[PDB]
Amino acid sequence: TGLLDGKRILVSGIITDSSIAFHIARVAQEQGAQLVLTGFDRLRLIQRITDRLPAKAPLLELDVQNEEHLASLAGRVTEAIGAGNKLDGVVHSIGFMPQTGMGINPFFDAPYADVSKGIHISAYSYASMAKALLPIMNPGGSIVGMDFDPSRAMPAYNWMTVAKSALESVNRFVAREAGKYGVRSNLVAAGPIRTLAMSAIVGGALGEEAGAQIQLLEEGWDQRAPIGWNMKDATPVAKTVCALLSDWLPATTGDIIYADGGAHTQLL
Amino acid sequence: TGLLDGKRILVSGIITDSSIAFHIARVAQEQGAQLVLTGFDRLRLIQRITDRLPAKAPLLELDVQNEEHLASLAGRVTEAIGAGNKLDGVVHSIGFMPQTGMGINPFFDAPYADVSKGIHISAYSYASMAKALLPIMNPGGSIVGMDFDPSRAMPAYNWMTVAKSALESVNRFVAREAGKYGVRSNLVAAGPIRTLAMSAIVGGALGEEAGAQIQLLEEGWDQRAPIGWNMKDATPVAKTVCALLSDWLPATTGDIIYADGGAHTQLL
Amino acid sequence: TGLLDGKRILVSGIITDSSIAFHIARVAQEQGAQLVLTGFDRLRLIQRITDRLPAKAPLLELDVQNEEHLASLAGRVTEAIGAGNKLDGVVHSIGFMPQTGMGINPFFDAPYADVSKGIHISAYSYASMAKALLPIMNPGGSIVGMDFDPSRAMPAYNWMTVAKSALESVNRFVAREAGKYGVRSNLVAAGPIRTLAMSAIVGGALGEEAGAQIQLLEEGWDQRAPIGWNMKDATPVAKTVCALLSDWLPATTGDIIYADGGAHTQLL
Amino acid sequence: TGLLDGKRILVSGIITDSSIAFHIARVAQEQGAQLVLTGFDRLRLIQRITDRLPAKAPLLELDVQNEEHLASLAGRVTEAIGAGNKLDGVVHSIGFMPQTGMGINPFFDAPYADVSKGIHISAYSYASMAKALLPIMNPGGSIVGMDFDPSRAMPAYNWMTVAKSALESVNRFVAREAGKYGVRSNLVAAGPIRTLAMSAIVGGALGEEAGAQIQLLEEGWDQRAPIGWNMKDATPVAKTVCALLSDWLPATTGDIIYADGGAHTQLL
Ligand SMILES: NC(=O)c1ccc[n+]([C@@H]2O[C@H](COP(=O)([O-])OP(=O)(O)OC[C@H]3O[C@@H](n4cnc5c(N)ncnc54)[C@H](O)[C@@H]3O)[C@@H](O)[C@H]2O)c1
Ligand SMILES: NC(=O)c1ccc[n+]([C@@H]2O[C@H](COP(=O)([O-])OP(=O)(O)OC[C@H]3O[C@@H](n4cnc5c(N)ncnc54)[C@H](O)[C@@H]3O)[C@@H](O)[C@H]2O)c1
Ligand SMILES: NC(=O)c1ccc[n+]([C@@H]2O[C@H](COP(=O)([O-])OP(=O)(O)OC[C@H]3O[C@@H](n4cnc5c(N)ncnc54)[C@H](O)[C@@H]3O)[C@@H](O)[C@H]2O)c1
Ligand SMILES: NC(=O)c1ccc[n+]([C@@H]2O[C@H](COP(=O)([O-])OP(=O)(O)OC[C@H]3O[C@@H](n4cnc5c(N)ncnc54)[C@H](O)[C@@H]3O)[C@@H](O)[C@H]2O)c1
Ligand SMILES: CCCCCCc1ccc(Oc2ccccc2C)c(O)c1
Ligand SMILES: CCCCCCc1ccc(Oc2ccccc2C)c(O)c1
Ligand SMILES: CCCCCCc1ccc(Oc2ccccc2C)c(O)c1
Ligand SMILES: CCCCCCc1ccc(Oc2ccccc2C)c(O)c1
């Protein structure tokens, strides 16, 4: 009955019940997946939030900048799912960029220390998670990361745009390695969604009238998308990730699927 | 429970049992879809062939160069599915190019009458099919066409490459129109499949070493594809089309999904 | 001293002194090129207009839909430049689309007869001109066509967008053939310029407030371009074509150079 | 009359006489440019090497990881060219990636400290160079960086591919900033050149069969390039950079010009 019935899927990146990762998890459970969740830093909050999911799942700590976390991850996952069992899916839904790299802060004024942290967490970690988890993935499995189309420059997105360009390149190399395991690796380039990162990171860096410029972003996206766009609903994006986690896109890898209402296909 | 359970899907483009359309149809039926078939010219042959599908489906005649077939199509489909009922999906799996625009035959020697017929059938008709059928499609519905990545030139594909470039452009305009119906329009860019068109029609224009060149094509595509590629197997491509016809990719339109083993994402 | 000193260059597509082809010619002559001009239909007007160029050049009739014109072209050119002499450059600056294929006229309502004519003239003719002229081009030579970025759908451009997508594919195949002669083939994707086609074809199809929507197009383009954009000046575009005609881009072929103020590299 | 007659151009990235920068510098000088050179670490060696350029040029030290070098660069360049004078051109020909992120060394085994150093030098520093030098550039000026098409993954280029993806994104944001100065920013995507970095640094990480693999690379690139390709010859690439530094591409910014023999436009 369910799209992901019996599949074992690790989902990273829940911070709140607005997180793209929250809705990926919710939809995957509705579709029968058995999940292992990973969280960063604010584990007490994340435990509270993940209790709003349809079903209980183990929560494991994972700071992608922490070499020890990464080194122990496959073992901790194997403890969570049981020896002899492997993952069928991995979801990377993780990003960060310091305020200097975002918004109205001048592009040239971001120190490399800041950019590097943003790139570590937002791009490099996709390789490092694939490295840790591929040895415990089943053939036919699927690794999915979250992208925002960086093909053209734009206001505010600034150095996160650079990190996503890097992520897209990483994805294609992860696909090379994953292929050896019979595993797919893809990115979902999503339209704008009202998440914590959108409000705290992107919004925080926009200065004043941020709420209006964000309302503006929604209205422009909605206009450009032939099927419209709603920033208040992550479900279409979560369903898309779930399609990639399923057996229904078996010949797609190294690739990007655009869950953006088709906005990137239209000039105006 | 099937991926496509309860959905009404029109599938064009069956001519042989090796046709991509034939496999899209089989998989759609295994996933619970009710089909309406359309066929060109050899309707007795198509009728016979499709008696070997999992389930019986009505078959209607459609020559996309015949403006009368196109003018009557919606009413004919309505009769086939029952008045009041609408289509949830449309599959355009239609291609033609005179052999003169293909193979070892010189690119410059294809006369425009030939090229134009190919473009008419291969690209323009995606818009005329959508024009005819959009008025009888449900919101949430899905139009899917078949592509072969024409972003780069290549031996032998010649003027068909040009027609696929046109088609990708047509798809994006179709999406604009389909969106007003709450309908999606996308293409599936498939890797090479050992269909009789590939082997016999195109392989027809390929010379005395055609068989070897086709095996060589397979070997190279399989090398390049991080997850491998089997030209003998249409199933991954048909599953990809079904994915688009399902409700699992609801924010994707005007777009292209590559079902090519990830080959296009790799240089070597 | 001149960029194109001693080079023999055929320039097609002058209709008025606002034509992109007019400015290509003007700039090429300023840079020392010896030109052969081709014109369509309105030869008396074109003769008057081409008398405003810095220097005299032979004018030859060429309707790209006329098989006889095309068949006699190399011979007529050889008569214009002298036996034993060959062309170093060819400029395709030609396009057409009937009103049904443009503007506010519904996309689905363009008859294929119309689209086909537009595609013949705007895309297919790039191959047919290359076919006629390559046998009289010097190695090191350069064929350049004019493009408008069709990667995304947009209002008004409609079926001309499809023709340019087709042109881009043709260009990459012409590059295959041209390479055998030691000749480059490239397209210049220009920003919007106030030419006859812009006003009569694009403007004519836009209905009412066309002048304001065109003013609007300029202002949006100017905003999106990091170095700004001026629709009233074709010179930056002509200089770009001249760069391609020169010896200064010797390793570029099958390709597209964007003379659009960088607008296509910016989302907003 | 030289292409670059009277222009003042800063050229970074000479380390050996096989350096792409070395050839850009030679060609620029043959075309009448006045150069300022910048070099990293081995300044005595660079001084010696560049004594073999057509013309003597001042050489300044620049480690792009040294924020003091970057803070003083504009003033140091001004002293070199004379106060009141400004630069017309800047060439970023700087790349680095620890061998650990290259060759037959496993993609997953490159530690982030290594990758980050590579990204810093290879991508971030394009923005910090532009930051430093924009204030002393003339309108109409041109910043040019060196790229290797990273749109697809590939053997051996590994993390450098990721850094070039980042760089292409950085280029587009640099263009936004440079436009306020009336300055252009573009990359040249070069085909493989048998520079000592290619052979010795990268070829260093390539195994016991490295030489053969490099010849194989050349043979395949030459096959794919419609106009052919010679890895032994930097001249076409240097001419391409000079083209961008000239006034002949004045509407192009935030962009990428492929000097690769047209290889990227061909599948096979
Ligand atoms: N919201 C949008 O509009 C949008 C659009 C396209 C793509 N995305 C992408 O979706 C993904 C999820 O972001 P979101 O929008 O759901 O916002 P979010 O705030 O809900 O999630 C971001 C996650 O990043 C995690 N994270 C940060 N640093 C980490 C670290 N060192 N280790 C482990 N995890 C870390 C945070 O814990 C948080 O859970 C990101 O890749 C984001 O770039 C978002
Ligand atoms: N076989 C491959 O490797 C491959 C790869 C990528 C894309 N494609 C595309 O997939 C689609 C299916 O091709 P296939 O390989 O299954 O070949 P096919 O010959 O089985 O299918 C082509 C269909 O086009 C139909 N057709 C031709 N003229 C028509 C007309 N005037 N009106 C209506 N229908 C007409 C034919 O009847 C046939 O049913 C085509 O668009 C093709 O370009 C094929
Ligand atoms: N004006 C712009 O904004 C713009 C932008 C990008 C690309 N372009 C391209 O520039 C090229 C030149 O157009 P333009 O804008 O200078 O307008 P234009 O009206 O000055 O030139 C169009 C030319 O097409 C020629 N032509 C039409 N049918 C022909 C035929 N059958 N045979 C031979 N020639 C024929 C006409 O004679 C005319 O000289 C076209 O390819 C156009 O698509 C224009
Ligand atoms: N060789 C090729 O085939 C090829 C192809 C495409 C692009 N490229 C690019 O061309 C550029 C030139 O490479 P090359 O092949 O001439 O190799 P190279 O080794 O001659 O040049 C690289 C330059 O990077 C400089 N550099 C390294 N670290 C630096 C630092 N911290 N500060 C300042 N400078 C530093 C080195 O000193 C050297 O001068 C690089 O960006 C490279 O990626 C090379
Ligand atoms: C106005 C800027 C353009 C629209 C932003 C849409 C967006 C919103 C949030 C996103 O997530 C992040 C962004 C930056 C840093 C970290 C994260 C998770 C993200 O990746 C994309
Ligand atoms: C030429 C070698 C390149 C690989 C061929 C892959 C392919 C095979 C068949 C295809 O379909 C057609 C092609 C031409 C004419 C008609 C059809 C259905 C098609 O569109 C693509
Ligand atoms: C509002 C539409 C989008 C901007 C149009 C810019 C433009 C203007 C003129 C062009 O030339 C032609 C256009 C259509 C048909 C024929 C030609 C020559 C052309 O190719 C492009
Ligand atoms: C790996 C095989 C792929 C072809 C290599 C072409 C190439 C060669 C050299 C290049 O420059 C560098 C690469 C890595 C580190 C430093 C430099 C300068 C570079 O950027 C690209």
CA A67 to chain centre: 20
Q: How far is the CA of B214 from the CAs of A22, B197, B207, in angstroms?
A: 46, 12, 11
> How far is B253 from C153, CA to CA, in rounded Å?
12
Q: How far apart are CA C254 and CA D203, in angstroms?
A: 29
Residues of chain C neighbouring B107 (CB-CB closer than 8 A): 127, 173, 176-177
- B164 three-state secondary structure: helix
Those residues whose C-beta lies under 8 Å from the C-beta of residue B67, and which sit 6 or more positions away, are none
Q: In terms of Cα–Cα distance, which of D50, D27, D39, D61 is closest to D244?
A: D27
The Cβ-side half-sphere exposure at D23, using a 13 Å CA radius, reads: 17
d(CA A226, CA B179): 5
Q: How far apart are CA C1 and CA C6, in angstroms?
A: 11
Give CA–CA dist C154/C151, Å, rounded: 10
Interface membership of C223 toward A (CB under 8 Å): no
Task: Calculate the alpha carbon distances from A15 to A25, A38, A193, C127 in Å.
Answer: 12, 10, 14, 56
Sheet strands side by side (includes B87-92)? B59-61, B34-39, B8-12, B87-92, B137-147, B184-190, B255-259
Among all ligands shown, which has an atom nearest to the Cα of A121? 1
CATH value at residue D227:
3.40.50.720
CA distance D85 to chain A (A): 24
A31 touches chain B (CB under 8 A): no
Angstrom distances, CA of residue C17 to CA of B78, C13, C194: 55, 11, 11
* Distance in angstroms (rounded) separating the CA atoms of residues B101 and A147: 39
Long-range contacts of C231-234 (CB under 8 A, 24+ apart): C231/C191, C231/C192, C231/C193, C231/C194, C231/C198, C232/C194, C233/C193, C234/C18, C234/C19, C234/C20, C234/C22, C234/C23, C234/C193, C234/C195
- How far, in Å, from the CA of D194 to the mean position of ligand 8? 10
Q: How many CB atoms lie under 10 A from the CB of residue A71?
A: 10
3-class DSSP state for residue D63? Answer: coil
β-bridge partners, D143: D90, D185
3-state secondary structure chain C: CCCCCCCEEEEECCCCCCCHHHHHHHHHHHCCCEEEEEECCCHHHHHHHHCCCCCCCCEEECCCCCHHHHHHHHHHHHHHHCCCCCEEEEEECCCCCCHHHCECCCHHHCCHHHHHHHHHHHHHHHHHHHHHHHHHEEEEEEEEEEECCCCCECCECHHHHHHHHHHHHHHHHHHHHHHHCCCEEEEEEECCCCCHHHHHHHHCCCCCCHHHHHHHHHHHHHHHCCCCCCCCCCHHHHHHHHHHHCCCCCCCCCEEEEECCCHHHECC
* Alpha carbon distance B204, A67 (integer Å): 57
Q: Which residues contact B76 (CB under 8 A, 6 or more apart)?
A: B60
In this structure, are residues C21 and C11 in contact, taking their beta carbons and an 8 Å threshold?
Answer: yes
Give the separation between CA D179 and CA D202, rounded to whole angstroms.
Answer: 35
Q: Using CB atoms, pick whichever of B220, B264, B266 lies closest to residue D154.
A: B266
Q: Measure the CA angle with vertex A236, ends A231 and A242; round to 5°.
A: 140
Could you count the other beta carbons within 10 Å of the beta carbon of residue D83?
7
**Number of neighbouring beta carbons within 10 Å of residue C214:** 19
Q: Whose CA is nearest to atom 16 of ligand 7?
A: C96
Contact C221, C213 (CB under 8 A): no
Chain B, chain D: beta-carbon pairs less than 8 Å apart: 24
Helix (H) or strand (E) holding D196: helix D196-196
For ligand 2, atom 12, name the residue with the nearest CA: B93
Is the Cα torsion angle D12, D14, D18, D24 positive or negative in sign?
positive
Check if A176 contacts D (Cβ < 8 Å): yes
C227 is in an annotated binding site: no
Query: SS3 for D110?
Result: coil
Q: Could you identify the residue written with the tokens 């003013």? A: C215
Q: How far apart are CA A17 and CA A233, in angstroms?
A: 11
Amino acid, res. B223: Q
Distance CA A215, CA B226 (A): 41
B32, two tokens: 């619970």
Phi and psi at residue B56, to the nearest 5°: -80, 140
Distance, CA C123 to ligand 6 centroid (Å)? 21
Question: What are the two backbone dihedrals, phi and then psi, of residue B189, each rounded to the nearest 5 degrees?
Answer: -85, 105
- Give the CA diameter of chain D: 54
CB C245 within 8 A of CB C9: yes
Any binding-site annotation on D227?
no
C96: Cβ–Cβ under 8 A, 6 or more apart, which residues? Answer: C117, C118, C121, C122, C197, C201
Half-sphere exposure of D178 (CA within 13 A, CB side): 33
3-state secondary structure of D143: strand
Instruction: Specify whether the CB–CB gap between C171 and C120 falls below 8 A.
Output: no
Q: Which of A146, A148, A158, A213 to mutate to test the pocket of ligand 5 (most atoms within 8 A of CB)?
A: A148
Tokens for B4? Answer: 């496509």
Q: Which chains have 3+ CB pairs within 8 A of C?
A: A, B, D
Instruction: Please tell me what DSSP assigns to residue D19.
Output: -
Contact indicator for D29, D4 with CB cutoff of 8 Å: no
Q: How many domains does chain C have?
A: 1
Please enumerate in sequence order all residues whose Cβ is within 8 A of that of D77, keeping only pairs 6 or more positions apart, or say none.
Answer: D10, D36, D60, D87, D133, D136
3 state DSSP class of D41: coil
Nearest Cα to Cα of residue A152 among A230, A42, A267, A67: A267
Backbone torsions φ then ψ of B166, nearest 5 degrees: -60, -50
* Boundaries of domain holding A151: 1-268
Residue in the block written with tokens 């099937």 = B2
Residue nearest to atom 11 of ligand 7 (CA): C197
C-alpha to C-alpha distance for B175 and B182, rounded to whole angstroms: 10
Question: Which residues does residue D100 pair with via DSSP β-bridges, in sequence order?
Answer: none
Q: Which residues pair with C38 in a beta bridge?
A: C12, C60
d(CA C155, CA C104): 8
CA dist., res. B143 & res. B133, Å (int):
9
Element (H, E) at D210: helix D210-224
Helix, strand or coil for residue B157? coil
Query: 3-state DSSP helix/strand/coil percent for chain D, to nearest 5?
Result: 45, 20, 35
Distance CA A68, CA B65 (A): 65
Q: Could you give the angle at the alpha carbon of A200 between the alpha carbons of A194 and A205, nearest 5°?
A: 110
Distances (CA, A) of D130 to D92, D164, D186: 9, 17, 12
Instruction: Find all residues with CB under 8 Å of C44, minimum gap 6, and list them.
Output: none
How many Å apart are CA A210 and CA A143, to the nearest integer? 34
Q: Phi, psi at residue D91, to the nearest 5°? A: -115, 115
- Rounded Cα distance between C225 and C268, Å, is 9
Give the C-alpha distances (Å, rounded to integers) separating D21 from A164, A222, D51, D146, D235: 29, 46, 14, 9, 11
Instruction: Give me A229's structure tokens.
Output: 């766009």
Strand order through the sheet with A59-61: A59-61, A34-39, A8-12, A87-92, A137-147, A184-190, A255-259
Backbone angle region of A6, left / alpha / beta, with phi > 0 → left and psi within -120 to 50 → alpha: left
Residues in a beta bridge with A266: C153
**E runs forming strands in chain D:** 8-12, 34-39, 59-61, 87-92, 137-147, 184-190, 255-259
- The number of angstroms, rounded, from the C-alpha of A16 to the middle of its chain's C-alpha atoms is 14
| Kind of pairing between the strands at D137-147 and D87-92 | parallel
Which residues in chain B are contacts of C170 at CB distance < 8 A? 162
Breaks, C-N > 2.5 A, in chain A lie after none
Q: Distance between CA A233 and CA C98 in Å, rounded?
A: 43
CB of A95 closer than 6 angstroms to any ligand 5 atom: yes
Q: Using CA coordinates, name the residue in chain D closest to C257.
A: D257
Residue indicated by tokens 């907003």: C268
The residue among C107, C38, C96 whose CA lies nearest residue C70 is C38
D130 in the Ramachandran plot: left (φ > 0), alpha (ψ -120 to 50) or beta? alpha
Alpha-carbon gap, residue A112 to C1, rounded angstroms: 45
How far is residue C134 from each of residues B108, B198, C141, C181, D49, measured CA to CA in Å?
Answer: 11, 31, 9, 7, 43
Helix (H, G, I), strand (E, B) or coil at B192: coil
Stretch (H or E) spanning B146: strand B137-147
Nearest CB to C254 within list B153, B176, B177:
B153
Report how far residue B219's alpha carbon sits from residue B212's, in angstroms, rounded to the nearest whole number.
10
Best mutation site among D121, D154, D198 for ligand 8 pocket (most ligand atoms within 8 Å of CB): D198
Separation between Cα atoms, residue D2 and residue B189, nearest integer Å: 48
Nearest CA-CA partner of A221 in A258, A187, A256: A258
Q: Of the candidates C228, C249, C265, which has its C-beta nearest D255's C-beta?
A: C265
- A188 in contact with ligand 5, CB cutoff 6 A: no
Joined tokens for residue C67: 């098989």
Helical axes C158-180 vs B158-179, angle rounded to 10°:
160
C232 close to C194: Cβ distance less than 8 angstroms:
yes
Question: What count of other Cβ atoms lies within 10 Å of the Cβ of residue D188?
Answer: 26
Hey, what are D43's tokens?
Answer: 């300044």
Closest residue on chain B to A242 (Cα): B248
CB–CB contact C191 D251 (8 Å):
yes
Question: Closest ligand to A114 CA?
Answer: 5
Nearest CA to ligand 5 atom 11: A197
B223, B255 Cβ separation under 8 angstroms: no
Question: Is D176 at the interface with chain C, CB within 8 A?
Answer: yes
CB-based contact D30:D4 (threshold 8 Å): no
Annotated binding residue at C77?
no
Q: Do C252 and D240 touch (CB under 8 A)?
A: yes
Amino acid at A13: G
If you ran DSSP here, which 8-state letter would residue B97 be given?
A: -
Residues contacting residue D266 through CB under 8 Å, at least 6 positions apart? B152, B153, B154, C172, C175, C176, C254, D224, D225, D226
Among A73, A76, A21, which residue's Cα sits nearest to residue A49? A21
For residue A66, what are its two tokens? 């922490």
> How many angstroms separate the alpha carbon of residue D43 from the centre of ligand 7?
53
DSSP-H helix ranges across chain B: 20-30, 43-50, 67-81, 112-119, 125-133, 158-179, 196, 210-224, 235-245
Q: What secondary structure does DSSP assign to chain A, as a single string?
A: --TTTT-EEEEE--SSTTSHHHHHHHHHHHTT-EEEEEE-S-HHHHHHHHTTSSS---EEE--TT-HHHHHHHHHHHHHHH-TT--EEEEEE------GGGSBTS-GGG--HHHHHHHHIIIIIHHHHHHHHHGGGEEEEEEEEEEE---SSB-TBTHHHHHHHHHHHHHHHHHHHHHHHTT-EEEEEEE-----HIIIIIIITTS-TTHHHHHHHHHHHHHHHSTT---TT--HHHHHHHHHHHSSS-TT--SEEEEESTTGGGB--
CA of C224 vs chain A CAs: smallest distance (Å): 10
The first and second tokens of residue D218, run together, are 């050349």
CA distances to A26, C93, D112, D150, D202 from D101, rounded to whole Å, are 37, 46, 9, 15, 10
Partnered with residue D255 across adjacent β-strands are D186
Q: What is the largest CA-CA distance in chain C?
A: 54
d(CA A240, CA B243): 10
Q: Smallest Cα–Cα separation from A254: which of A176, A188, A181?
A: A176
DSSP SS3 for B126 = helix
